Structures are given as C-alpha cells and as structure tokens.
Amino acid sequence: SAKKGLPPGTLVYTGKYREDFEIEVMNYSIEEFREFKTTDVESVLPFRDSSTPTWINITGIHRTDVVQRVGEFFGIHPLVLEDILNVHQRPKVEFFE
Amino acid sequence: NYVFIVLKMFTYDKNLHELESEQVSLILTKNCVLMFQEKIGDVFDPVRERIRYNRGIIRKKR
Amino acid sequence: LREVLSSLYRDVPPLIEKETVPYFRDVYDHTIQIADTVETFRDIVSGLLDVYLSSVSNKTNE
C-alpha cells in the first residue's frame, strides 16, 4: 500500500479522502443532551473525565494532528492510532483494559 | 521429547509465473528450536531483528 | 498448514506451555483466512476461464 518499510509506529493516513474535516460531539445524559460541531481539539478534550456518556465523531482523519491529539489525551496507544489511520485493513477487534 | 513440524516457504518471481517452494523443518526440543532449510536467506528476518533488539515480548518468553 | 496449526492449538503437548497457547490461535486464524482467500482466488480463476468462454461464444455470435 502507501506505507512500505515504515516502522510499526508511524502515523500515516493511507486513505484518499482529504476533502473535509469536522468534529461533532454529542454528550447525552438520561436528563438532557448537548451537541456541537467544531474543528478544534481543545473543546473536545474535557469530555474524557465526564461520567455521562459522550460520542465524539472525528469526521475526516486526513488530519493526523487531531487524531494524535485525541489519542494521546484519551490514553490511546500510538499503535491503535496507526491502525485507525491505516485504512487498508480487515475489520478488527482488540480489547485493552 | 520434542515437537516436529514441517512447513513450506513459497517465493514468487515477477516477470514470470512460477511458485518456488523451500521446505523448512523445525523441531522444538528441550527449550531449544532447531530449524532446517535448504537455501540461504529466509522469511524469519523480522524475528531475527526482534530477538536482536529486544523488541516484542519474545525475549521474556521461552 | 491448517491441519498443522489446528493440531498445534487443539490439545496442548507438555512441550508447549499454556501461556503461549492463545498466540497459536492467531496464526491458526491466519491460516484459515489464507485458505479462504486461496479458495476465493480459485473461484475467481474459474470465473476467468468462464468469462473467456463467454467471450468466444458472444464473439462467435457477432
């Protein structure tokens, strides 16, 4: 594919969809809900420690910067980020603690 | 006393269409692993590098 | 290959330790995928033969 000979730690976007980028966050509790779209990571970070369920959709992973930011803030291993950005692969399931 | 395993390693040549097979026969005995091949060069270079540079959990294991 | 890896996972000899037994599943699963892929490839080749047949018949018609 696009990556060949890279060490298994490099974050490359193998896909070819780079047209659009956005981030939508929907934080919903059995009481209320709050939805907002943006293109920044600072307003996405605080939801890690919120006990209420949250759904953070990063539409467009051509921006390796945002994926790296959210992965390193949410305690996501760089290998998992590489798997996210590596497009040409089988559906996978991995269980971390 | 040992576990004996026989595999084939396949190689494909571009500009032609021919499979070439090399038998690799490996025996696990008394915390050692013997390997038997017929050509120099194989497909286990990643394992060699991992053992060399303490990569992966192979070093911690038997 | 599938028989070898299934036998390596199914039933554990004293030489193989349980700690590494799940790892074999990985390669075993891999082997299964390989078979499927190879099986699929076979089908494709047959279809290729078939399409050629179709071609000549259609070509004949023309």
Partner: antibody, heavy 129, light 108 residues
Framework: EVQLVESGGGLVQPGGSLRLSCAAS????????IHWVRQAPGKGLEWVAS????????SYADSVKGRFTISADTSKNTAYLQMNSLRAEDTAVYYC???????????????????????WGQGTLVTVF | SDIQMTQSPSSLSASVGDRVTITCRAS??????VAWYQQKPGKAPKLLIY???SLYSGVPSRFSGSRSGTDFTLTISSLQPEDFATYYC?????????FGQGTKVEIK
Amino acid sequence: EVQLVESGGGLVQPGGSLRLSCAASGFNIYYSSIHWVRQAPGKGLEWVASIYSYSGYTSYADSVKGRFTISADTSKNTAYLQMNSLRAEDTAVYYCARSFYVFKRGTKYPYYNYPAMDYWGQGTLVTVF
Amino acid sequence: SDIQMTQSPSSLSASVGDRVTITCRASQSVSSAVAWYQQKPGKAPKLLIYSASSLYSGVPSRFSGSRSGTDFTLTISSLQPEDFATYYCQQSYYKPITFGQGTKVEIK
C-alpha cells in the same frame, strides 16, 4: 553507541529567547519521539514538550503551551526547543530523551507497552535573570 | 484536568540491604503505563522499570515493579549504597506525561 546530547543552555534575561539543541547519534529522529523534560533546582522532573517528527506533531505542557516551540531537523538530525519570553519559573536543567515501547501485534488481547523515556541527554542549565 | 500522580514517601531513609518500597498512585487508572526512573545528583535520570513491571535491560535485576489497580510500587530487595538517589514515578497513558513529586532515598 546511541546517545543524546544537549547544548545551548545559557542565561536569558526574563522575556528573552533561547534555543536548545539536542543532537542524537545512533538513531534517526525522523522516526522517533523526542521529549524535552525540565527539572528545577531542587524540584522534581517536569515534562515540557514532545515532538513526533514524521507527522510534524508538537505536543506541549500547559506551562509552556504556545511559549516554547519544538521542531526537528532530519538533515541535521537534531531536535531544537526554541523559547520566547522566558519567565522566572523556567530556570531549570533541561534534558532531551528518546521514548520507546515494545509491542506485539495480532492477538485479540495485544500487549502494547506505553512509551517511556529511555535515553536522556546530559541536559543543560537554563537560568533566567 | 491533567493526571496528578502522588508519590510517597516524600523522603526515604534506608540502610544497605533493606527492602524498601516507594509507591505512586494516579488519580485515574493509567493501566500499566507507569515507568520508574532513577536520578543521581546532578545527572540525567536513567530508566529503571517500564510498563510498571518489566525490568530495563542494563539495570541490575535488583529493582522490582508491582502494580495493584491504580497503585504502583518500586521495590528494592537488597539496597546498595550506589542506589541512594532520587526516584521518579511517571505515567505514559495520557497526554501530559506527569511525574511524581520525587522520592529521595538517603542512608539512615
């Protein structure tokens, strides 16, 4: 064989600019993460910055977020930490370190170690006065 | 909202060949991402333990690392006079890599 060294530590009048240079031998920084760590005299270690040079990703600490700027050079194979408008709290010994992790892929329960700084340079004193 | 890892004891007094344990606890579960570093006076800290249990290649096998939930411990079985230096507990799970406040082991 592999070793990191830091140079450029020097006295800076509060509000100045200063560039630290971390030169590494034995590995290419284009493929690895370079971490800048800070240690005030008598206090513990305080992580400053990190660069993943391949994607040009620069992560910073809150205390220097926007103030410092970390950037790598592959041709020179050197990681530079630029500072603008240094404050009083910035006086400390700075070190550059290489993070690493050993991993095994494939399993449904993969063994993914998290990166830990491995090789640290000798560090340099950065005094603000 | 960066993780704060509290490491205790703040100071440690011990003699040669003593079993000494320095424990650091993280506010959130950092899995097994904790590392233990040793720093000699006026020197670059060297990595003792990574992944909270594994022993680095090069360090003597004397040091040990244990994990229990959100608690991590660095243990020295037979302390040596060379091992009288500051010890730091680090997380690697989350974004700002945070160290412990430090622990200095001094001869008693």
